[PDB]
Ligand binder design. Structure first.
Ligand code: NI
Ligand code: NI
Lengths: 20, 462
């Protein structure tokens, strides 16, 4: 995608995959 | 990408090409009028300017292969792009040979002005010998196709073009790896409709900038890439590509509904044979250069890469919110939150991809619309109508360019082309360009387009 989303939770700053 | 073996054409039976290795590039009438430090690339192994083994240098690009099949990250990524593509309703059915060879609106005819493949070039057979626009006749192509078959060797040679002095000492010339006309046709029949839809829809759904007109497409970019911009450069993208990326491409072609015969053409690109001068050699991985859809397939792959790279580096990445467009290895993207390319680069390297700061920038600083670069060009809002965006080719490239010519008869067309690129930088610098052009008797004889007239014409495009 690219255009505007909606459902159903807020997006937060990406979080750097740690170790894993 | 990685060379698997090399064998003399003697041992393979492949036809060699007897090139001369002489550059068609001459210093132009503005040669010492403008400033620059580039000159014709090294064309053969003994050029007096080589501080290295040529053949050595040419093939260093094949840095090897890291993945041969997709992890989960690359699979999840191939699907999202494929999904995104679905809304395009792409015509998955084969193209007529006539269309494939002679074009359509949104699919341009095969260039009669470049080399036909192996073995045509070696045998002295020309494109014009087979193709005729006036007749749009395909019976002779069919005849040659039936004669030589398919999956022929990429005939390979050094690109005749200007290089920086460092790239000339270090022997960093570039190669043209042309597919045989047979495969170019056969490929275009398999994907010609996809090519049409990509050419017709440069932008954020295709994720492609191929066949775009920067004059106008540039204005659309700010709108298509909202939020936080990011961007980087690749070191030898094409040659660095691992087979996993060709796997990932088939994945996508399949999800969007391509047949298994169409999908089998991708291998003949992953896994190739070349004939450079007289050694033939197998390459596995990486993407060739003069291959059809080479741009589109590269861009598609880049559309997957940026994804895989993201969901793998970070956590909580929503891919529906990624905006990108790609042209081969050239990328521009945005995302609601800033994206750390220092990290993407680390995770990207695990995949055999060398990623570096955008615009040769000292590090992965914030990319903004002021420094941002795409297809070599910057973004300069028009002073009067700020919503109109100028594509800005650096004057330095234009300077480099004006000092040479492959044909001295062609100085008028040569210069106005450079002017069509130059004026976008603004009146003050355009005049400074023209004035140094007009600083020489030949330059005054020249018809040079006038600034406000150039601009006017451009306005009329919107
Ligand atoms: Ni000189
Ligand atoms: Ni082989």
């Amino acid at each position: 995608g690219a255009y505007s989303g909606a459902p159903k939770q807020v997006l937060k700053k990406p979080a750097l995959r740690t170790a894993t | 990408g990685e060379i698997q073996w090399v064998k003399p054409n003697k041992e393979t039976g492949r036809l060699s090409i007897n090139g001369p290795t002489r550059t068609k590039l001459e210093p132009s009438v503005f040669h010492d009028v403008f400033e620059g430090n580039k000159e014709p690339a090294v064309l053969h192994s003994k050029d007096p300017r080589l501080e290295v083994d040529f053949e050595q240098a040419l093939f260093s690009k094949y840095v090897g292969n890291t993945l041969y099949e997709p992890d989960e990250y690359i699979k999840e990524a191939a699907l999202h792009y494929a999904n995104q593509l679905k809304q395009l309703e792409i015509n998955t059915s084969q193209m007529s040979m006539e269309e494939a060879c002679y074009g359509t609106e949104n699919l341009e005819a095969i260039d009669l002005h470049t080399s036909a493949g192996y073995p045509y070039s070696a045998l002295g057979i020309k494109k014009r010998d087979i193709l005729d626009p006036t007749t749009r006749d395909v019976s002779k192509m069919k005849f040659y196709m039936d004669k030589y078959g398919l999956d022929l060797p990429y005939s390979t040679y050094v690109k005749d073009e200007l290089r920086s002095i460092d790239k000339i000492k270090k022997g960093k010339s570039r190669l043209i790896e042309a597919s045989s006309l047979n495969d170019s046709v056969y490929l275009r029949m398999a994907f010609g409709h996809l090519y049409e839809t990509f050419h017709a829809n440069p932008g954020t759904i295709t994720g492609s900038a191929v066949g775009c007109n920067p004059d106008t497409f540039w204005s659309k970019l700010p709108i298509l890439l909202p939020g936080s911009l990011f961007a980087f450069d690749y070191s030898g993208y094409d040659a660095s590509l691992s087979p996993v990326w060709f796997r990932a491409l088939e994945l996508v072609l399949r999800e969007i509904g391509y047949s298994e015969e169409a999908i089998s053409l991708i291998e003949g690109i992953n896994h190739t044979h070349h004939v450079y001068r007289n050694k033939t050699y197998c390459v596995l991985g990486g993407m060739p250069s003069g291959c059809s859809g080479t741009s589109i397939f590269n861009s598609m792959i880049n559309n997957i890469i940026i994804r895989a790279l993201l969901i793998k580096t970070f956590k909580g990445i929503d891919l529906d919110e990624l905006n990108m467009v790609a042209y081969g290895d050239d990328v521009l993207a945005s995302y609601p939150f800033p994206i750390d390319c220092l990290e993407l680069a680390k995770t990207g390297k695990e995949y055999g991809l060398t990623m570096t700061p955008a615009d040769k920038s000292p590090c992965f600083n914030e990319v903004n619309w002021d420094n941002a670069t795409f297809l070599k060009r910057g973004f300069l809002p028009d002073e009067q109508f700020p919503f109109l965006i100028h594509p800005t080719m650096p004057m330095r490239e234009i300077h480099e360019s004006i000092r040479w010519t492959k044909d001295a008869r062609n100085t008028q067309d040569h210069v106005r082309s450079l002017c069509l690129l130059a004026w976008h930088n603004g009146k003050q610098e355009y005049e400074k360009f023209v004035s140094t052009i007009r600083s020489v008797p030949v330059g005054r004889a020249l018809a040079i387009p006038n600034y406000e007239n150039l601009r006017r014409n451009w306005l009329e495009l919107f």
